């Protein structure tokens, strides 16, 4: 089976920073597209950042210049560096593999709450 185990979330003040990590197993990491998703309470899922197999990256507009996605293939890890956090960033964040067809999978999530 595929396993995706996120951690690194926490409660932090606005303007602060966090680093999320995602431990992957049970599939061929280096040939997968990798995603960060988030779910703000009251809302559905939205994509935040993705990285393809050559290290090229894409971001949602609202996180540009704030969040950075990266991958460490040798250690089967996905990272999300989150700088200059906003209250509106409060959400559960999920790592994901191959979220577009056929067999998308999501991890268990790590909560990030930004509050003064």
């Amino acid at each position: 089976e595929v396993q995706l185990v996120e951690s690194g979330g926490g409660l932090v003040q606005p303007g602060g920073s966090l680093r999320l990590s995602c431990a992957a197993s049970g599939f061929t990491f280096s040939t997968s597209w990798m995603y960060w998703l988030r779910q703000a309470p009251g809302k559905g899922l939205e994509w935040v950042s993705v990285i393809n197999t050559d290290g090229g990256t894409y971001y949602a507009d609202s996180v540009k210049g704030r969040f950075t996605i990266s991958r460490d293939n040798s250690k089967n890890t996905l990272y999300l560096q989150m700088n200059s956090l906003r209250a509106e960033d409060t959400a559960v964040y999920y790592c994901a593999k191959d979220w577009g067809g056929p067999e998308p999978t999501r991890g268990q999530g790590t909560l990030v709450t930004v509050s003064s």
Binding site: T28, T31, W33, Y35, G44, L45, W47, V50, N52, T53, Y58, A96, W99, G100, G101, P102, E103, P104
Partner: protein
Amino acid sequence: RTKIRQLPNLLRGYEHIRLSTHNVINAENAPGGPYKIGTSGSCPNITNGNGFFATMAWAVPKNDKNKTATNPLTIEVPYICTEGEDQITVWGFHSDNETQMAKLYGDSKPQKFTSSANGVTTHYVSQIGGFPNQTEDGGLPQSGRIVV
């Protein structure tokens, strides 16, 4: 790449229009399978789970043993509407880059497709990689594309 855009304009030309409640064929056990049914984060359904177009089933080889190239296979698509009604059948094919193709389908060469109904024939050859930018879609990045 197809005539697909005119579909809703064709439909509106009829007085009565409905989507069948039955599946015209069984996807899982279709020729060249068995297949598992692909779903996507681009198409969130009502409870926000990964879904896909109700008109189609994304056929992905279930078993590595049968995950290989295939010669063209033929299925008959029956008429399941009630006498007097026209049936409009929606179908297509998914494609991707070379490496994703190998991983998904066990084959990374171009694939070929034909349809035939009432003497009208159409032919398509797929494209591997080098796709145009995403447009009119779910706004989520994908390496692959479908033709419908």
